[PDB]
Amino acid sequence: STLPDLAEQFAPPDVAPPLLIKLVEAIEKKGLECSTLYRTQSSSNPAELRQLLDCLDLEMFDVHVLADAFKRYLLDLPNPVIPVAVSSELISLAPEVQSSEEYIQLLKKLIRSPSIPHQYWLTLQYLLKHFFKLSQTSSKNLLNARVLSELFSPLLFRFPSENTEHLIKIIEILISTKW
Amino acid sequence: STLPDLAEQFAPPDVAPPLLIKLVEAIEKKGLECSTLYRTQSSSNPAELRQLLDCLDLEMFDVHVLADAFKRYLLDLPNPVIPVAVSSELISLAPEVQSSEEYIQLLKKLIRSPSIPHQYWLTLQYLLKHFFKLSQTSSKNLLNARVLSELFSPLLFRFPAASSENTEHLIKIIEILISTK
């Protein structure tokens, strides 16, 4: 797993990692209406998926393989899209705080911190955009904000339990549109 | 004060921040043989030098202003070229580690850590290349590797520490890495 840090894959004024852009655009072109996108295990193992993530047109690949490589990408990032410091703070507030809008405002504040490269917020924004576009064809792909949140929150925060429930809902709301 | 983090100013495959490249290339074009480069102050204050670090061709400026803007840039980076995490560990090393080669090995390992974006090490390498290029015209600019280390180590590490055998070691490694490029 040689995948560089998000901050090493691109920098402003670019808006997202170029590899993540290729994956998202190919997946959206080929699987926007696939009733099982992101919920089916393809036949490829991590080593094969990583070969795809190390270099040519991703549209040539099976859409279920692209979906698995997307997940592999989020898993292999040296640091998760939502850094551990941010997740740790949100989780330790879990019993004391229960306002979703407060969690959302705090997540935004924490992830835009000066100590955290801007690329993390930018990538999160790009992923939320992708997840939201999928939810607009939910009647066909069955991926609504809630399902998308349950699938990807563990990859974005990098957790496998009851504390997590607050994090999942945050993503669900942010997918559906919010601050 | 508004200078973005090194990790936000560029990313691979670029090798250094574009602004730093402009400064270095202009300084090398106009001052490679200047015998007081980096050793005299220009008349501009920090606010004016920061003004320059936004926006034109930098070759248009007085070379002594460019040299001061170069220093201003290193000082205004939100985190120094050599992050404090690295400096703290290096300064903490015991006297039994008397080997410059060991300090260098640890600097590379610590600064290449996944917790530190590759841009910091890349920027340091670009600066060392510049410092090495200067030391090769020492017969005219009077700049050797050691003096360049003594001048710029406080800007690269940005570390208030009392002079010790640890501080001497960090200056020494920078000296070695300049002459080794």
Swiss-Prot record, chain A:
GO biological process: cellular response to insulin stimulus; insulin receptor signaling pathway; insulin-like growth factor receptor signaling pathway; intracellular glucose homeostasis; negative regulation of apoptotic process; phosphatidylinositol 3-kinase/protein kinase B signal transduction; phosphatidylinositol phosphate biosynthetic process; positive regulation of D-glucose import
Keyword Transport among UniProt keywords: yes
Transmembrane feature ranges: none
Entry-annotated residues carrying Phosphoserine: S42
Residues of the site described as Arginine finger: R39
One GO CC term, this protein: nucleus
All residue ranges annotated as the Rho-GAP domain in the record: 1-179
Top-level division of the source organism's lineage: Eukaryota
Protein family membership: Belongs to the PI3K p85 subunit family.
Domain remark text: The SH3 domain mediates the binding to CBLB.
Name of the protein described by the UniProt record: Phosphatidylinositol 3-kinase regulatory subunit alpha
Organism: Bos taurus
UniProt gene name: PIK3R1
Segment of the intact protein contained: 113 to 298 of 724
Swiss-Prot record, chain B:
Domain of life where this protein originates: Eukaryota
Modified residues (Phosphoserine): S42, S163
Domain annotation Rho-GAP: ranges: 1-181
Site-annotated residues for Arginine finger: R39
Coiled coil: none
Post-translational events: Polyubiquitinated in T-cells by CBLB; which does not promote proteasomal degradation but impairs association with CD28 and CD3Z upon T-cell activation.
Family assignment from sequence similarity: Belongs to the PI3K p85 subunit family.
Function text: Binds to activated (phosphorylated) protein-Tyr kinases, through its SH2 domain, and acts as an adapter, mediating the association of the p110 catalytic unit to the plasma membrane. Necessary for the insulin-stimulated increase in glucose uptake and glycogen synthesis in insulin-sensitive tissues. Plays an important role in signaling in response to FGFR1, FGFR2, FGFR3, FGFR4, KITLG/SCF, KIT, PDGFRA and PDGFRB. Likewise, plays a role in ITGB2 signaling.
Subunit note: Heterodimer of a regulatory subunit PIK3R1 and a p110 catalytic subunit (PIK3CA, PIK3CB or PIK3CD). Interacts (via SH2 domains) with CCDC88A/GIV (tyrosine-phosphorylated form); the interaction enables recruitment of PIK3R1 to the EGFR receptor, enhancing PI3K activity and cell migration. Interacts with PIK3R2; the interaction is dissociated in an insulin-dependent manner. Interacts with XBP1; the interaction is direct and induces translocation of XBP1 into the nucleus in a ER stress- and/or insulin-dependent but PI3K-independent manner.
Domain remark text: The SH3 domain mediates the binding to CBLB.
Protein name: Phosphatidylinositol 3-kinase regulatory subunit alpha
Stretch of the intact protein here: 113 to 297 of 724
